């Protein structure tokens, strides 16, 4: 199986997975079943941001989530990720729906990875930056249901005609690029991400969530993974 | 054939393509026969850097390329890019020797884009930087004889276990993820690159050059093109 | 008096001082008398996008404004600016009323100023982004009646109580550091700014308009500068 | 007494004030006695990087110091600076020599800080980077013995004419701009800073040491800092 490092905006409580009774934050290691949550007051139909940081030197990976007008909500986990993760890795944003549904649009996502060395001339890094989505984005890898274009913007999980979002939906979209996130002469190895979210349904339970994730390069959307499993992962172990 | 933009930093005047009689630094749109040049006092086993940027607004290209304790050389030709190459390309970096030889050797490369639409939230950007090579840089793609990681560099041409450089040698690095220079919402439009290399040769007359080039997604080395042709041209049209 | 470089977002047209008979764009260097202009479809209520961008190989002062959902306006001069201004300058935005009025308020400013060197560790930069402005701003310099902090934004010019605008005023705000424009070693200097602002006004004749400048370090509003001098020129010569 | 935060690569071992037995690195709050150190194989005569990096959401102070061809060395110490420091402070590097003494040469100078609102546009920043310092350093702010410009350097302490550092000195820099480290409506405020210095010595001993520091806005060399002090602290308490 793949392996994946995740934080999850998890929209709908699944109790037996160890999901706490209400939408949330939580960082995944190799597992839905998130390390570490927090309570997370999402709000149907409003545009939010996530921001995602961790370096090398602290091993902690954190996370923030909020909405204009309101209070914001975080979580962290300590975690080494270069015993986690390969040296390269790709990184992406999933996400689900089920029986249960929602939009699953982002509206721009922005990354930075950085290789401080101990030479002289130290800096190494890759940054990329979307404030929109074409049709036709090269520089993404979509898989499953995702989309890009319609409105400029990328869209997770399948959205009818009507702008309808539909059920039992699975999609991804990773970064083209491998990008490195461990060298032997690394001093300090940093990333951060942003994404700004639009998670809209005509329910009172929207499912299942939007998350950003750090894969192995050759990551590919596990079968049967609709649903609490987020595209991200084979069962719910 | 392929479609190319190139700065070319060249080493051996070949007059019967229009080089002018000493190295230089010259403008290459769709031709190995610049459309401008200008005189560059190249420095055999000195580490020197070159700098390449453009925007839509102007639609000028413009390089400079100079030495730690020298004055600089600079060249810059009107060109509309947008009507030259294709809404997606890959950049890189190539480089030759022919029965003249020299090494090719890159230190660094950074490279920025950016797209400023009209909306709200406009940017849009691709940089990455490189002060290293590892023997798998995943984030290139290698062509040619073109290798990474000996002295933690990036070797265009082929250098030979004493470390000479070797004749009849021609190789390429492209970045891994396409790059979007035209959108149909953009504004303006830009790029930097900038690279450090170290040419170094045996003899009085080295050849024959490293180019910073913008090309086609799928653009490869073209047969022939060692020499004069610097790995970027099948001829001398 | 002061040496004022600006590109103008021009809401009045003033004939008798070369305005042309529309609200414009312009590229004022060391007069209120554009050296170039283009037509401007300036959109009252609207929040809008500047973009001002130089560099010393190509001594081509450019500029590019947009709305969301309009085409774009565009002016470009060439200046070489180190025969204008000082070695090192401030930068800031301006903006002024006079017996017709308007608010002159903006929502976000960016800055980037770069100076390569020949030198082996060849960048200098600046950068600030401004997203939101606090009452108490300190890396900005108020002049006139500018202030900073209502509803989280830099309101250059006088708005009462009532949020409406008014006339006969006239307010800067400059950044703090100064800025380094030349240096004896750089092989290239640059900068970009970015800017949005919302002009609203309740007459059907806006004035006076809003501008980007670049100054000696120790600028002020000159004596007499409402209206139509856009708070940068102490006459209209 | 002002407020300072730093982190120290502390040449000489002061035994009653708490140093170890050897050159370190270690973090200063508030106090000359560091929380937190580590041993650091200072190299005499050799560039050395220093990189420091902290963000509102982890509230962990760390930094690393390294040679080229050496390892590393780094300190982290748990503190929230925003119930240390005010929410406006100036940035700066400080050094001091004794009876005992070395030079403080400074090669090159970043620094990063970012305030991200829940705001729609969300980010604030301000960069700078000094890879080279000039006879006229307009934006930044010298004390004491610091000058700038011999060799493009920035020497915190006095170097004779010869190039011999003299003893009984002290000297700072500091960035002209106040810089905003915490904001009401921040999500997440972060800083980096990378420094490169050169300390040399004729001496088998080198003394005092050479700080990064963040202070209150109005901070100076307090008196009788040289030393053991680094121009950071009125006293050893
Ligand atoms: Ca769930
Ligand atoms: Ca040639
Ligand atoms: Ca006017
Ligand atoms: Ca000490
Ligand atoms: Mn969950
Ligand atoms: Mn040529
Ligand atoms: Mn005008
Ligand atoms: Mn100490």
Request: glycine share 6%.
């Amino acid at each position: 199986a793949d392996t994946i490092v995740a934080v999850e905006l998890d929209t709908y409580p699944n109790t037996d997975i160890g999901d706490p009774s209400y939408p949330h934050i939580g960082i995944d290691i190799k597992s839905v079943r998130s390390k570490k949550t927090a309570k997370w007051n999402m709000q149907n139909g409003k545009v939010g941001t996530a921001h995602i940081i961790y370096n090398s030197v602290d091993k902690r990976l954190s996370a923030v989530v909020s909405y204009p007008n309101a209070d914001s909500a975080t979580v962290s986990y300590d975690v080494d990720l270069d015993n986690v993760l390969p040296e390269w890795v790709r990184v992406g944003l999933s996400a689900s729906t089920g029986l249960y549904k929602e939009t699953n649009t982002i509206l721009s996502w922005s990354f930075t990875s950085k290789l401080k060395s101990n030479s002289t001339h130290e800096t190494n890094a890759l940054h990329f930056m979307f404030n929109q989505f074409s049709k036709d984005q090269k520089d993404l890898i979509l898989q499953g249901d995702a989309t890009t274009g319609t409105d400029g913007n990328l869209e997770l999980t399948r959205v009818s005609s009507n702008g309808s979002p539909q059920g039992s939906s699975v999609g991804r979209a990773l970064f083209y690029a491998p990008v490195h996130i461990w060298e032997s002469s690394a001093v300090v190895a940093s990333f951060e991400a942003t994404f700004t979210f639009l998670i809209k349904s005509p329910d009172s339970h929207p499912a299942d969530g939007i998350a950003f994730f750090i894969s192995n390069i050759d990551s590919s959307i596990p079968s049967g993974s609709t649903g609490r499993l987020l595209g991200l992962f084979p069962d719910a172990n």
